[PDB]
Amino acid sequence: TANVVVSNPRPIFTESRSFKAVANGKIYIGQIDTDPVNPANQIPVYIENEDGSHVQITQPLIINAAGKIVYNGQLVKIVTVQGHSMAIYDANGSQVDYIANVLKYDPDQYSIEADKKF
Amino acid sequence: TANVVVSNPRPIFTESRSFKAVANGKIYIGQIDTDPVNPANQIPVYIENEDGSHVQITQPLIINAAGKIVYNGQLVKIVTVQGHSMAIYDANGSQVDYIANVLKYDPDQYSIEADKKF
Amino acid sequence: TANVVVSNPRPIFTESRSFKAVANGKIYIGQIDTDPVNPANQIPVYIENEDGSHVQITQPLIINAAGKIVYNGQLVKIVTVQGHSMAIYDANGSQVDYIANVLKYDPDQYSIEADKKF
Amino acid sequence: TANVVVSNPRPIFTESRSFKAVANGKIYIGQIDTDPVNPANQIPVYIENEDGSHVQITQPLIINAAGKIVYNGQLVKIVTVQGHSMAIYDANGSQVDYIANVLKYDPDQYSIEADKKF
């Protein structure tokens, strides 16, 4: 039976009005319905490594020239503990987007969840 | 647990034969395994606002130049039920894409049966 | 009155360093934590149709100019039975991306494990 | 029982010598077998309105370029009693038509005697 569907794991961040990536942009995520650039509203962000290291990083996420989140020049997967609010800023510093509430669950590591659940 | 992944909100809809957004394209959401173009198969879709209210909107969703769903030229968050079929048409009326069940495109298909078994 | 955002389920593969699709690239699907380019490490891949039927296809998945998987000049959904690793190379043969464990577990073997331990 | 026939409302009045409407023509409705031009023999004619009221109107009915009865340049529904004579004159005063009893032009003349007999 089919258990896995071939998909792209890397999110892509583009402009609001045109089909261009937010090159060298910034992402601030924090408490829902707030201003995430305020460090008091910010919430912890972790890099999920290929094995599950989950190492915490500083809040401002850097967007590559392809529209992907990078850390130390490497594509990384970023995870959070709760639903949040997002603020994407351009390389110039203009507000590309603000979202008051986002929550997408990680579709990976289901064996651990099943062990903790069943 | 870091079960929430920092992904891209405002989903992007792209042409199926080139790296281009479906500008002025139409999207129909309906019941699973049916044609959502026919309004008898359509299901409610709601704009989710900052204050938290959900406002049902007219079914054909309009895609802007960036590939994102807009209401009056403004980027909005659209919510429906988990089980639905989607039809994406270009501005000239040609089918861009069809998906009979979005839930079957999740990377992990073993989770559904595991939750429905134990 | 809804509990999921309308997203784009069909995967799209773009370049990791620039905002452009992997046009006429290749995707190799293989065993977990291996090099899937080697045919020894490759695993069977099927296309799942709208009804739900599966058709086994040759391993190298063709990406089109839109950055999407196409088998007979038509968009197809690729499925596998066991957990796999995915390597995406561009049309020039340079590796674009590599994931050694897409779900960080093997649903095929964990299905057997959970059928007895749950 | 489908005893109602889908016919043409707004009856059309045509010139008696050529295939042309009686534009700016005059129609007089009066008693059966009489000269309706004489106001002594004229009978009431009523505009039937949307609200249902019947408003008696001046006897000479005006025919437009389409061959239909108008009041102020507006298509109207005109009603009277079943037994009446009709005179149609052109805009130049020439007689177009005269009918001494409209009820004698019904396709089935046996209905009247059959109704009055049994």
Added chain:
Amino acid sequence: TANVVVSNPRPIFTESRSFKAVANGKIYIGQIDTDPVNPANQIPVYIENEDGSHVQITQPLIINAAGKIVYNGQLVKIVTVQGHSMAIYDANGSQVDYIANVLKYDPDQYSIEADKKF
């Protein structure tokens, strides 16, 4: 204050495929469910005057340029005793219309029938 719409009782015959009268056309009146062009199938036809007198005339009824029946260059009302079939041909001899039963019953024989049974 009325129970019938003012209509045009004088018949007008126009082309069945184009908006034009049957100019100088022929009308043949004959037996029910037959071909009335054949003189053997024809029935007597009379003209009824304003007073009410009847004048029998030859079967082929002339249709003038206005689309109306004229015998001596004047509009006439055509009557028959028994139910009939009607065939309208244009000036070029092509058939324009055919009705095999204008009233869908024969008043002549049904008169005796109703006298017997009612």
Added chain:
Amino acid sequence: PIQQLPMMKGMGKDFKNADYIDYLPVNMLATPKEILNSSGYLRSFPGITKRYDMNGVSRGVEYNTAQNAVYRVCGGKLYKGESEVGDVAGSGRVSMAHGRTSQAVGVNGQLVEYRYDGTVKTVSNWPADSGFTQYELGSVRDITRLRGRYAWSKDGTDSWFITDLEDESHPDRYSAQYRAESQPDGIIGIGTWRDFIVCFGSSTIEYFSLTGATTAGAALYVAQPSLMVQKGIAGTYCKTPFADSYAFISHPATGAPSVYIIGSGQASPIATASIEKIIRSYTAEEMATGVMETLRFDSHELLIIHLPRHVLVYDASSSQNGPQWCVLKTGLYDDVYRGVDFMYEGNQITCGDKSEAVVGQLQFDISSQYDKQQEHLLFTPLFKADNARCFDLEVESSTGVAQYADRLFLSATTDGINYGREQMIEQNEPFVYDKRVLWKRVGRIRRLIGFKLRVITKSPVTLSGCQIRLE
């Protein structure tokens, strides 16, 4: 030049006598509220959805402030809410009152008291074995309650009686009978304004207060001549407490009837000339059978008058330019409105029915009455615009809450009576909140012009800001 056209009141001519009359909106209430360039809008009357099934058409209603419930007489039954609590004989309207121990119904010339313990009594004279006064208790016309006593009027004899304090099933032991007495006759109705018994006759309305006497046989009520109104009421149910006093319809005994509100010894007219003409179209009968009631919701203070052919609603909260009147109706062809006996209970307005054994609850996100699509009219006054050649007929409509893309029949009249061609323009769309209802090319105006603006909907209709471009 853009010109604004009022829609809260129309204007036209009556083809029967060639007089000028007003064209009241149908199934529309005017709400004064600055929306945008409008300073008021027009909203459809709320629709009716089925709530309960009863024994017959409604004959009375009251809010029982003792039981904290609505009592409805329907057919042969009396209900406290949804459950039957008694049997009532007759077929027409009944009087309704209540107190500490019972709910009283005035019907068939009797004051039948349904007690909460389950027993039913009827007001009658004390038994002759008692040493108490016997009175000429004839028929009963109208009943009311005040200070723990039932006060009811004897049919056609100018007299009224009160009940005993410790026994409401009998009149008072010593002094029960009173008369208005400032009149040759007339006791048509009875009510209680603040702490007075109000006797509504023909050509008089009289007030009575409690004397406070203690001696046996002394009068317990005394008339207040300073508060009496020199006008009467047409029928027993042609009166209601509207704002802080009684609104009523006057008797033909004082001239052509109209609608009045009692002030302080005087009555102020509420009806306009068109309302007076509508009332005058009825005989003396068909006018004594009219039923008046009041409604209150969303700052709307409505006075509803049911007649055999008209249901007229007066809005006191939207009468800044003169009295504001509208017509309520069921169907598409001027059939009378079916809703009657409105009463607010819980958080809903509940009504009876004039033709079916049902009850409604007056839903606010629809406009259909029992799932049947209804018709709404909004006329504009006639105006003289010789050679005007108008354009751009715009109206502002609140869209979005609809089940179908329901349309608008737009027509124009040039003589004030007959309307012309109707154009169908979409005025609403499901889940669309930005529509711009509009018609570009209106014709040329010869002498006069006026518009009808007819809608047929199962959904609420909200229209404001009618405007034209006159060039």
Added chain:
Amino acid sequence: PIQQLPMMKGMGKDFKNADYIDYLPVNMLATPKEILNSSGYLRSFPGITKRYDMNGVSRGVEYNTAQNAVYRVCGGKLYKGESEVGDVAGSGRVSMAHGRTSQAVGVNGQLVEYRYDGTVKTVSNWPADSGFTQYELGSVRDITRLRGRYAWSKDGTDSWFITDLEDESHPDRYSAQYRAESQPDGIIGIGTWRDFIVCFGSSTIEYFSLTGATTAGAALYVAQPSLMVQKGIAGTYCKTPFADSYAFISHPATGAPSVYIIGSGQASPIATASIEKIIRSYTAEEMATGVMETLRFDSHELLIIHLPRHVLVYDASSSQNGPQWCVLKTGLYDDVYRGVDFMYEGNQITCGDKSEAVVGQLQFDISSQYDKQQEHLLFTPLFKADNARCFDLEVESSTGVAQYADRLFLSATTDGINYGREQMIEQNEPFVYDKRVLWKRVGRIRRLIGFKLRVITKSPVTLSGCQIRLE
């Protein structure tokens, strides 16, 4: 062309029934004051900082004019200031009164009197060994004090009683029982206006004054029918002395409820159509559980109404353009306002809590509630500006008192329901008194436009002078 945009009251559409409703400011009060080209500003409601720690949520509060102190019931404890002075049973709202020698709490159907000497008594009938009258003392609904006596209403039985002059632990020896009696039923609440016992029933409000009688058994109170109000109250705590009379919420027994202030024999409406709709959204229950209080500071005369889902504040001193209403809330997602039971003592306003066992003191140089940032909203009315292309959205903000460079979410709506993208503009800065909050390029207006102006701060928000350039 510069156009000024009011923010004291917004405007929009309800997407449930497509009706027009007002958008009240959230956590903002309107102060009429000529600042500059504005003639009024909008200031954030003062924040709440912790003062004391109590046993539970607040159930009552009163200023003891005898002790010159504030008495609060929290959880199971009764406090005079900060120190516990008694134990109170129950879990819900309680009635409060006080006199020369005791603080009386009406709770659990009892009138429990906590005397300043430390002993606690309860009102009960005189011992049968006395030659004094015995009464049917049932449950206690509401209590009040007047002229050295406690007056309390029996639950659901229309009667009320007074205590004895020389013994407040018992009813009066001879004449203690009184009845409103101008009503079939209803004794919902009790109060004292000037020198009257006011009995707030359903469908009536009655007034009683001292007779001055001296004979034993004679009535000590007599009803004043001239002062009666023909309207009721929704619940026992749906009333409060607002300006010089009582403001209340009416009962469903008189139609759809709204907010009234008692005049002279009449009630004047205070709520608008939107407030009436908000009230109508509640059943009969959840409306009798509402609470009404009064606040007074900086010429603000606030009438606060707590409901299970809304806290609505009416400003009497800023109602020159119609009634002025606003919403108080806690958090960012329309959670009800946690402050309740406000009372001015010393030089500070002190409040209880609805969810925690704490007390606040309403600090004025912050806007956070217990160190947690709060949200403020300011809407503009919709207007028609077809093809306008507006520019230079300015607002005047009083900056300087802040801990962070807090920002403003500025969005626009073109249909009245859904708002577009939000732009972040710094509206305040610590120790900066010249800011010029402004957005240069707003888009073109197709048909309609309106703004939302959302702030989230721990510091006071002062906004005025909204203006745009329409070109």
